[PDB]
RNA sequence: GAACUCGCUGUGAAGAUGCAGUGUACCCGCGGCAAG
RNA sequence: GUGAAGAGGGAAACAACCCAGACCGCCAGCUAAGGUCCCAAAGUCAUGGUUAAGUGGGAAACGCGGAAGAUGUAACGGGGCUAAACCAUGCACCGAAGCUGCGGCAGCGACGCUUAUGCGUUGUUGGGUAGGGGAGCGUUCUGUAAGCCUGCGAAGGUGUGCUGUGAGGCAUGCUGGAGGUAUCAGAAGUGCGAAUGCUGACAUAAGUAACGAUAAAGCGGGUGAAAAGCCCGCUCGCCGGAAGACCAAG
RNA sequence: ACCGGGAGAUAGCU
RNA sequence: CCCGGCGAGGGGAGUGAAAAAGAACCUGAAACCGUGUACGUACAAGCAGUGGGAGCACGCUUAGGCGUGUGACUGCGUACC
């Protein structure tokens, strides 16, 4: 008697749209987080994921509680000498909110091989249209 | 039918005569003999000269068909070494294998 | 019966042997310590 | 009476060698280095059939919370209502049901909410 | 050894003496008389229980011929003997020394090795009394 | 200045890895004689582009 | 001793490439700058 | 008390903090400390408040300030958190080698059938430096041995399978072509992994700087299968109180 | 200054 | 007999039980270095192993999920004296 193993290959994973639009960051990045790894689905399995994919919409329409407005501020090494090159999170998200949606969610989700395989599964767009609408994405709410 | 040539404590090194032979392998006799004959390498001079011995031998031992023969295996080891005051002069051992398929 | 001939029990001991393995015992210095 | 202890030391290296097939070069060739190895990977063995236990129970649990969740009830909550109805169900076989059975799990889960109250 | 930071010819060398070499020694110890004669006692006392023991009164050959003792064997059914008596004979010595299995000694030719070893032992009525006589 | 380890063989065999020399596999043919040669180089027997030359 | 020989933060018989967290980086060569 | 001489778990890792004494195995359940947003498993739990300060998540004394600290926020573990922080109460789960459930052993007694001296219960022990006690495997030599196997194939080497708590033991493919040796005992020059231990062999650095006067070579021809440094001729150049020639010694 | 022997000379300690 | 340089070395035929006995000459393992075969790797960070493990080729009960060769990936894991 051995336990069923996930087979990486024969496991399923559709697509289902999430649009924010005026919730909490960090429970929307959590439920994703939750989502993309499958642990909601019976099947889970940490081999392989199981994850069903997402694309995320209205990036800059995250909302964000407290003095986050301003005190909340990302950082990434620029390298080289003095590489202290900062960014604010209110520049960045008016820039490409789509960097600061992906960084969060590779921040909650476990970092690696397959943290990065799973990474690749989750698209994050600013504008509401979306070009994957071939595969008949499903409309699930979070 | 298969054939193979081997020589015996060659005045060379055990790894630089792999070199040349490494263009040997896989490669048919028609184009191997002219690629030696035009290599700088002193270690083609023994590749060719190992070659010649091979495909004379698959002449005389077989009838006839020596075009067709087709190299197959090739390989180059170590041989005895000689000391000497510390200086230690290695040999290579090199062995050719034709055969038509 | 001329290999039956044996000696009696407990009248012969091999005695332990210091110096030859960790698993007997004891182990290096000879089982005298430091 | 010399005795040679040359096959004696080949019989053992032969058969410790014998379990260090594929160390990475060195470690699977080298006495030195081989009997390190291989000590190094009993102690890992040994710590790892008792971790297996751990893991296992660790992987029943994930998927008896996601099959919950699913359903539409906590783990904790389902726990409860099992442990309330008098059953004695471990963890590994409803893991096992929740995959390749769905009618099964449905009707265990709503034996556990009528039972939790 | 031979010849001259340590010696060559420390054991830890090679071609050197051993740490601790045997030297002439004798592995032989004393036996006491009242334990051998008990041994001795005991080992026939096992014999004759084990009915390995045949006692003829007369069993000398008219000639030295080896035929003749390998015959008596034959015509006895038995081929391990021991064959001991009180008095050597010379023509029964001399015969039984190309046999290597059947061997002869005299009345005080006792020894433990001789009796456990040969399968069967066969004696006379005067070495049966000379044993009596003597340690018992 | 001195190794703390000693490499292992695949260190050697990716730093060798570049020590593979390329056949020339451009055999020219003389126009006349008709014997493979080097490109731009007097054949042994001492033609080149079909012309002869002293070819001692 | 054997190597699939990265930077930063923290612990550290007290400056960590092998410890915990974290970021980066296709695999492998060549000539130099000597911080270790 | 711990370590010394205890593994396991939790606190980011941490030898001194907390829980917690490893007979072995099992893909079974319950609990210790510690946790239930993830990484990384469990309530985004319930009741009434505090906390709008990212304090929580680093700081005294003193009168909300005090508060400035670890080059990076870097003193929340990372994200992130307005409850995913704190206070008081409650249940439910996760949670160690802890306990229980099952299987398999070594020992300790206690009890009886008392035996043939074993059997059936019986509760318990089985982490461990040094040290002590008990019990075993393997190799040469000798008696057992003029026994037995072996040219229908033994030793040594090399793979497979079957065995036992264990050193280990047995059958078997493969080159091998002449010894090995049952059982019980005796007797050891007896079991290797570090002592800058010793003899022999083999890799690293490596195709690596260098190829050892910076007086300076070049051409035609010859031997040779292969030729600048092998030989002859020719042009130039170096030394020329030397780098020239002779004697003493070797 | 070198060779063979006392000499496996003797104490500590690795 | 042939290649070969009238060398060295090698390959045929024969002798030879055996030339997997050829003057480097009984049997001939490791450290060391080679070719073919089966598998993995060029987005993947740390004593390089340990349990889980889909996949990749072969023989088997001619599937019935058995083993052999490798381990993409994953929880865990700071050498010996």
Redesign the pocket.
């Known amino acids: 008697?051995?336990?069923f193993?996930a087979?990486?290959?024969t496991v399923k994973r559709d697509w289902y749209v999430v649009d924010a639009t005026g919730k909490?960051?960090?429970?929307l990045?959590?439920?994703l987080?939750?989502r993309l790894?499958g642990?909601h689905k019976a099947e889970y399995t940490?081999?392989?994921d199981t994850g069903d994919y997402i694309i995320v919409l209205n990036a800059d329409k995250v909302a964000?509680?407290?003095?986050?407005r301003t005190?909340?501020v990302?950082?990434?090494?620029t390298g080289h000498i003095?590489g202290?090159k900062?960014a604010t999170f209110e520049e960045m998200i008016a820039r490409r909110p789509e960097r600061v949606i992906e960084?969060?969610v590779?921040?909650?989700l476990?970092?690696?091989?397959?943290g990065?395989?799973m990474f690749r599964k989750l698209k994050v767009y600013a504008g509401n249209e979306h070009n994957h609408a071939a595969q008949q994405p499903q409309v699930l709410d979070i | 039918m298969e054939?193979?040539?081997?020589?015996?404590?060659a005045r060379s090194?055990?790894?630089?005569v792999r070199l040349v032979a490494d263009l040997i392998?896989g490669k048919k006799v028609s184009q191997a003999l002219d690629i030696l004959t035009y290599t700088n390498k002193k270690a083609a001079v023994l590749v060719k000269?190992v070659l010649?011995?091979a495909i004379?031998?698959a002449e005389?031992?077989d009838g006839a068909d020596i075009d067709d023969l087709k190299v197959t295996?090739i390989?180059?080891?170590?041989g005895?070494?000689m000391?000497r005051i510390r200086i230690?002069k290695?040999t290579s051992h090199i062995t050719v294998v034709v055969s038509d398929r | 019966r001329?290999?039956?001939?044996?000696?009696a029990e407990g009248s012969?001991?091999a005695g332990?042997?210091l110096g030859?393995?960790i698993g007997?015992?004891?182990?290096k210095?000879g089982?005298?310590?430091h | 009476?010399?005795?040679?202890?040359?096959?004696?030391?080949?019989?053992?290296h032969?058969?410790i060698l014998?379990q260090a097939?594929?160390?990475?070069?060195?470690?699977s060739?080298?006495?030195?280095?081989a009997?390190?190895?291989v000590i190094?990977?009993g102690q890992?063995?040994?710590?790892?059939?008792?971790?297996?236990?751990?893991?296992?129970?660790?992987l029943?649990?994930?998927r008896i919370?996601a099959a919950a969740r699913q359903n539409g009830i906590?783990?904790?909550?389902f726990?409860?209502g099992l442990?309330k109805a008098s059953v004695e169900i471990?963890?590994?076989i409803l893991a096992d049901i929740a995959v390749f059975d769905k009618v099964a799990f449905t009707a265990l889960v709503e034996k556990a909410k009528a039972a939790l109250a | 050894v031979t010849g001259?930071?340590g010696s060559i010819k420390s054991?830890?060398?090679?071609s050197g003496?051993?740490?601790?070499?045997?030297r002439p020694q004798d592995?032989s110890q004393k036996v006491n008389k009242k334990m051998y004669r008990g041994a001795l006692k005991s080992i026939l006392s096992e014999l004759v229980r084990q009915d390995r023991l045949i006692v003829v009164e007369k069993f000398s050959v008219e000639a030295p011929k080896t035929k003749l003792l390998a015959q008596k064997l034959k015509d006895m059914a038995l081929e391990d003997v021991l064959i001991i008596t009180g008095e050597l004979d010379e023509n029964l010595f001399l015969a039984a020394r190309n046999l290597?299995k059947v061997d002869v000694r005299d009345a005080t030719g006792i020894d433990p090795v001789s009796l456990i070893?040969f399968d069967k032992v066969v004696m006379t009525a005067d070495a049966v009394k000379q044993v009596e006589e003597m340690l018992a | 200045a001195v190794?703390?380890?000693?490499?292992?063989?695949?260190?050697?065999g990716?730093?060798?890895?570049?020590?593979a020399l390329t056949a020339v596999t451009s055999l020219s043919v003389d126009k006349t004689s008709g014997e493979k040669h080097l490109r731009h180089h007097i054949t042994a027997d001492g033609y080149y582009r079909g012309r002869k030359v002293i070819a001692?």
């Open positions: 008697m051995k336990t193993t087979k990486p290959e909490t960051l960090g429970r990045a959590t439920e987080a939750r790894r642990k940490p081999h392989v964000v509680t407290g003095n986050k005190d909340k990302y950082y990434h090494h003095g202290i900062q960084i969060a590779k921040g909650m476990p970092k690696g091989p397959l990065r395989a | 054939t193979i040539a081997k020589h015996r404590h090194s055990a790894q630089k392998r000269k010649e011995s004379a031998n005389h031992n295996k390989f180059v080891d170590e005895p070494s000391k230690l290695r | 001329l290999n039956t001939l044996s000696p012969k001991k332990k042997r030859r393995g007997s015992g004891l182990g210095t089982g005298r310590g | 009476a010399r005795v040679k202890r040359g096959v004696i030391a080949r019989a053992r032969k058969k014998k097939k594929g160390y990475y070069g060195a470690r060739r080298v006495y030195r280095v009997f390190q190895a190094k990977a890992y063995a040994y710590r790892d059939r008792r971790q297996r236990k751990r893991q296992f129970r660790q029943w649990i994930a919370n906590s783990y904790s909550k726990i409860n442990k471990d963890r590994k | 001259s930071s054991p830890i060398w090679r003496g051993v740490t601790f070499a045997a592995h290597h070893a | 190794q703390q380890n000693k490499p292992t063989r695949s260190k050697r990716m730093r060798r890895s570049h020590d001692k």
